[PDB]
């Protein structure tokens, strides 16, 4: 409700009262040079969806907005130990494997990609016109996850993978009150867990967070080449978290067009396939006596140190 009020979509219950806060702020921030249109100038980049993310103030404005949503979030009861454990299910391990690199290591670098700008060059002579763009990229990788079942029965579970920095700005281990807001969603997908031990392999280019590299460079999703943060040349430390939640509670009543098909497209699908709050389990304050991710974790969760390495070099795309 709050998101519709703040954006001010049509669905806002009272647009007279709560206004059109997000859109109008954008417009305000884009018009400081000509607020009464006496200089006949258009809006800055913040006034355009296409271009707004270019401006540093985009993050400042949206952080201001986030504080409002956070103000709602902290009112909700912490998730209980009951609410987090999946009884019988226990995750013992998660590792990341890349090609040619040590275990628990992600790799980023720069890449050059060509794109045909010919369909967009009005009144220029026809023919291929290639623009070469430089952009971040990571080396492909796979998660390996070990889950021990313990039921005699098959169990269905949502695998929810996030990643965050280990340390704050000052190189000090982060605490849950801060870390939870720094958790970046990396993947969410359904699995079937046989009784006893299960070994799940999940490639990076399967992430439900992303969309193929083909769709950026010649069904909404984050661009595949920005899955992994830059990291550092000396190595940047992160915490990788995974939770296996109970799908029998997370299941959504709707049945539409193998449950394991998790590619969600807002136009295609009438309802969002996970009853949990988006961002679960990090969207609330910790239950009493949890101070850090180490104390938060239930058995169906697991944590791994991961080193994110940046190499300042450029590859032609393979």
């Amino acid at each position: 409700i709050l998101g519709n009020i703040i954006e001010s979509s049509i669905l806002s219950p009272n647009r007279q009262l709560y206004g059109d806060m997000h859109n109008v702020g954008h417009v305000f921030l884009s018009y400081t040079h000509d607020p009464d249109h006496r200089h006949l100038e258009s809006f800055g980049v913040m006034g355009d969806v296409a271009t707004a993310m270019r401006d540093p103030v985009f993050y400042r404005w949206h952080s201001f907005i986030d504080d409002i949503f956070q103000e709602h979030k902290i009112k909700l009861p912490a998730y209980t130990k009951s609410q987090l454990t999946y009884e019988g299910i226990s995750v013992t391990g998660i590792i990341v494997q890349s090609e040619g690199a040590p275990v628990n290591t992600l790799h980023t670098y720069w890449q050059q990609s060509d794109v045909d700008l010919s369909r967009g060059m009005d009144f220029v002579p026809r023919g291929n016109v290639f623009a070469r763009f430089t952009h971040l990229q990571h080396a492909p990788f796979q998660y390996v996850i070990q889950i021990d079942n313990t039921s005699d029965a098959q169990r269905m579970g949502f695998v929810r993978i996030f990643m965050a920095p280990k340390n704050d700005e000052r190189g000090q281990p982060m605490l849950f009150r801060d870390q939870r807001l720094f958790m970046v969603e990396m993947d969410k997908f359904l699995v079937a867990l046989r009784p006893g031990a299960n070994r799940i392999r999940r490639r990076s280019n399967e992430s439900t967070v992303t969309i193929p590299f083909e769709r950026t460079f010649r069904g909404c999703g984050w661009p595949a080449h920005m899955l992994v943060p830059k990291g550092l040349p000396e190595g940047f430390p992160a915490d990788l978290f995974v939770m296996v939640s109970n799908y029998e509670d997370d299941r959504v009543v709707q049945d539409l067009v193998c449950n394991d098909a998790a590619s969600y497209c807002g136009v295609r699908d009438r309802l969002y396939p996970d009853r949990k709050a988006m961002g679960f389990p990090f969207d609330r304050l910790a239950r009493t006596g949890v101070d850090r991710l180490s104390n938060f974790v239930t058995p169906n969760m697991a944590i791994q140190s991961v080193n994110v390495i940046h190499i300042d070099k450029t590859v032609p795309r393979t």
């Binding site: 956070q70 902290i74 009150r177």
Partner: protein
């Protein structure tokens, strides 16, 4: 009959009945001036206390104001100006000492009041009075440290003193070293600021501020020019001065509380004990939650969302550029007076 000098004696040893004699003097108090407890042993009292002293101070019996409100706070209870009930009690006792016609009647009224009132409250109210009456200016009040060390010192040093004073004849006694940087260890980076937070001078400064600009009392004492702005400015210079110290201890500028719902990370254990209340200032654990208040005795029934509400009201008033009176009339937060 230097009443002024004699009033200073009322600060000596606040928990000792007044008949035990202060410095080299004793008061000769009327028998109806003693408490119910000690009236029966009146004869014995005169013997030791009364006789051993150089100066004996006659107290004239007078008709006394209604001291119920100030007596309503217990002698072994704790006293806070932040709690409304206690502010109201203090305001009244202040009015009473302000309103005595005569410096002689102040002496007589205070002598009566003293062993029937909470010592902390007595110190506060009497002090505010002496600082504001025409007939008690230029008077050298004892530092609150000197008369209530229990609010300023590691509770561990009291038995060290008790012993030294009891075993050793005075001419031979060694000064007691007051511990420093004693409230926390190296594992709490906040301990680095002991010399700011736990310095008797700065805590005295905070105390003195509430002596000159009390929040409830007679108009004459409350209504100083621009006191609303001094409130802002003082609390503001503290943060400026506190952050200066932080930058000198490899810390960040201080961060506001984000909100009133999320835990407070930095706990604190003061290591102080009150000899008036014989109860501690309980520390706060790390990562503690602000909780809805239902303190029947303190007369505080207030939810966190009641505090959220005031803050909201205040922000609306700042954005509007005016506050609304109890009648509904607008008072503008202009450039001259808005901050006040």
């Amino acid at each position: 009959m230097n009443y002024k000098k004699n009033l200073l004696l009322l600060y000596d040893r606040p928990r000792e009945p007044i008949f035990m004699g202060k410095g080299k003097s004793v008061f000769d108090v009327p028998d109806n001036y003693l408490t119910d407890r000690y009236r029966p042993i009146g004869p014995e009292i005169q013997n030791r206390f009364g006789e051993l002293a150089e100066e004996r101070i006659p107290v004239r019996s007078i008709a006394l104001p209604d001291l119920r409100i100030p007596m309503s706070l217990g002698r072994q209870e704790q006293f806070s100006l932040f709690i409304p009930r206690h502010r109201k009690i203090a305001a009244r006792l202040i009015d009473i000492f302000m309103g005595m016609r005569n410096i002689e009647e102040l002496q007589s009224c205070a002598v009566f009041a003293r062993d029937r009132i909470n010592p902390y409250l007595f110190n506060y109210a009497l002090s505010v009075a002496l600082l504001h009456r025409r007939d008690t200016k230029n008077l050298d009040l004892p530092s609150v440290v000197e008369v209530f060390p229990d609010k300023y010192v590691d509770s561990r040093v009291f038995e060290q003193i008790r012993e030294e004073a009891t075993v050793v004849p005075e001419g031979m006694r060694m000064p007691i070293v007051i511990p420093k940087d004693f409230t926390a260890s190296d594992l709490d980076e906040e301990h680095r600021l002991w010399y700011f937070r736990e310095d008797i001078g700065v805590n005295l400064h905070h105390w003195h501020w509430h002596l000159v600009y009390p929040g409830d009392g007679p108009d004459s004492v409350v209504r100083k020019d621009r006191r609303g702005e001094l409130f802002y400015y003082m609390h503001s210079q503290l943060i400026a001065r506190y952050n200066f110290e932080r930058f000198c201890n490899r810390l960040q500028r201080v961060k506001r509380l984000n909100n009133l719902r999320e835990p407070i990370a930095e706990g604190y254990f003061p290591k102080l004990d009150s000899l008036v209340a014989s109860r501690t200032w309980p520390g706060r654990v790390d990562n503690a939650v602000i909780k809805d208040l239902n303190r029947e005795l303190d007369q505080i029934k207030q939810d966190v969302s009641d505090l959220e509400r005031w803050i909201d009201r205040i922000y609306e008033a700042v954005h509007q550029g005016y506050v609304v009176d109890e009648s509904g009339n607008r008072i503008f937060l202009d450039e001259e007076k808005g901050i006040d």
